[PDB]
Design a protein around this ligand. Structure first.
Ligand SMILES: [Ca+2]
Ligand SMILES: [Ca+2]
Ligand SMILES: [Ca+2]
Ligand SMILES: [Cl-]
Lengths: 96, 84
């Protein structure tokens, strides 16, 4: 019963409160989930050269390079700190 | 409690045009119920394409006049505890 579902995953920051990553703007969400119909909340920054997406299991922003989709690692929306480094296996090229 | 996070983008360019949250619905999940979106794995987890048959079911909760002819609209179902 509901509101247990609420606590299932980490709620996403509001666009205004994403600190220390530059000015941000929502971008059309394209990255699909497997167990859902949800596409991942997406923001862009640095004039659209950087992409952040919400990882609601981990509670962290995953960052990427728009030109080729490269993973930049993960970031903490409250402070903008890098929490994990770039993982060269990972990218979003197929969902740009 | 529960807020619908509505977001929309220009059809031609894909540029961001606007974001608006609904008022809080507390623990009443029946708005989701009426869109046929199961609670499971969908609360706090992804945006959903706002299709034509969803417009009349959402328009009440928003100031923005939703024009699916002009823009791509997405809703996501966000949950935090209390007034947020
Ligand atoms: Ca996405
Ligand atoms: Ca992760
Ligand atoms: Ca028109
Ligand atoms: Cl409001």
């Amino acid at each position: 019963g509901f509101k247990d579902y609420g606590h299932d995953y980490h709620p996403a920051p509001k666009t205004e409160n994403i600190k220390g990553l530059g000015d941000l703007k929502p971008g059309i969400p394209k990255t699909p989930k497997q167990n859902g119909g949800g596409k991942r909340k997406r923001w862009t920054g640095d004039k659209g050269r950087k992409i952040a997406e919400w990882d609601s299991q981990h509670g962290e922003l995953e960052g990427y390079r728009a030109s080729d989709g490269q993973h930049l690692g993960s970031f903490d929306p409250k402070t903008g700190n890098q929490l994990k480094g770039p993982d060269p296996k990972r990218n979003i090229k197929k969902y740009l | 409690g529960l807020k619908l996070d509505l977001t929309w983008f220009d059809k031609s360019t894909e540029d961001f045009k606007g974001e608006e949250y609904s008022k809080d619905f507390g623990d009443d999940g029946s708005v989701m119920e009426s869109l046929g979106v199961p609670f499971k794995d969908n609360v706090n987890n992804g945006c959903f394409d706002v299709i034509a048959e969803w417009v009349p079911l959402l328009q009440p909760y928003f100031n923005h006049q939703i024009d699916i002819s002009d823009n791509e609209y997405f809703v996501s179902f966000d949950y935090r505890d209390g007034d947020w």
